[PDB]
Amino acid sequence: KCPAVCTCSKDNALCENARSIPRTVPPDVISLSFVRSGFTEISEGSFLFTPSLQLLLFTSNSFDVISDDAFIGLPHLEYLFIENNNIKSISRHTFRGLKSLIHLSLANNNLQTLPKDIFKGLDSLTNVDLRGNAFNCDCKLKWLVEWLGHTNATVEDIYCEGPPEYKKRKINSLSPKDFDC
Ligand SMILES: *[C@@H]1O[C@H](CO)[C@@H](O)[C@H](O)[C@H]1NC(C)=O
Numbered sequence: 240k241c242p243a244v245c246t247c248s249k250d251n252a253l254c255e256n257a258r259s260i261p262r263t264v265p266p267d268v269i270s271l272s273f274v275r276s277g278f279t280e281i282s283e284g285s286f287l288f289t290p291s292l293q294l295l296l297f298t299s300n301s302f303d304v305i306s307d308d309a310f311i312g313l314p315h316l317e318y319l320f321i322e323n324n325n326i327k328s329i330s331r332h333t334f335r336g337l338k339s340l341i342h343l344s345l346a347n348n349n350l351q352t353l354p355k356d357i358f359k360g361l362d363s364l365t366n367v368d369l370r371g372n373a374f375n376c377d378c379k380l381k382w383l384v385e386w387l388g389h390t391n392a393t394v395e396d397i398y399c400e401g402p403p404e405y406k407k408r409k410i411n412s413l414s415p416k417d418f419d420c
Contacts, residue, residue, distance in 0.1 A: 240265050262288040270294035270318070281305045287312035294318035301325040307332035317341040317363070324348050331357055339363050347371035355382045364392045375401040376408065378420035384413045 241247035242261040245254035252268045254261065258277035271292055280303050286292065293315050307330045310316065316337050322344055331354040334340070340361050345353075346368040352375070358364065367390075374380065376399035387394060387410065397410045 260285045264289045266291050268292075269315075270296070272296035272298070273300060275299045279303050281309040283308040284311055286310055290314060292316050295320070297321045298323045302327065304328040304330065305333050306330050308335055309333055311336040313337055315339060318343075320344045322347045326350060329357065330354060333357065335360055337361060342366045342368075344368035345372070349373045351375055352377070352380055353383060355379070358386060358390075366393045368395065369397045370395055372397070374399045374410065376405055376410075376413075376418070378418060381415075381418060381420060384410065384415065387411055 240263070241252065242254065242263055244257040245252045245261065247265065247268065250268060251270050251272070252264060253272045253274065254276065255274045256277055257273060260278065260281070264271065269291055271289065271294070273296065279301060283306055286309075290312055292313055295310075295313070295316060295318065297320070302324055305326060305328070310319070310333070313336065317339050319334075319337065319340055319342075326348050329350065334343070334357060338360065341363050343361070343364060343366070347370070350372040358367065374397065394411070398407045399410060400406055
């Protein structure tokens, strides 16, 4: 029953070089990991048939887009780790539908931006790891500083690489009074 592209441990399954997201994952598996996967995108409703997942991991993947509602149908997901990936586009409602999500890590994806209200609706969120990215200080990321002021969750210090004059400036220290838009 363990998917061909995956190897299953005691309560966990790990998939390497998977050409597609398997929908036949055993129900007893509560966390899933995708490493160097073949598929280039996460379309909406991909995890609908694996509702038992409490933790999800994506590492060493190259993703064109992670679209809206990709993680819909994951009510029990408390942990989502997307790290060490090449992600060209992340969508506003990507994480919509995860109200049990506790720890979310987008660290080390070399992302240059995040869409507004990407963390809206994540109520159980106690920690967010945005470190290790290529964020550029702009007006469109403006919302982020506001979200960093009014957020419960613990978010470690992150910095914008550009513009070159404002390189390595503390995103957490940044305030609405600093950027003119
Ligand atoms: C975090 O938010 C919840 C409601 O979503 C609230 O009950 C709780 O007091 C907040 N934690 C704080 C303010 O430390």
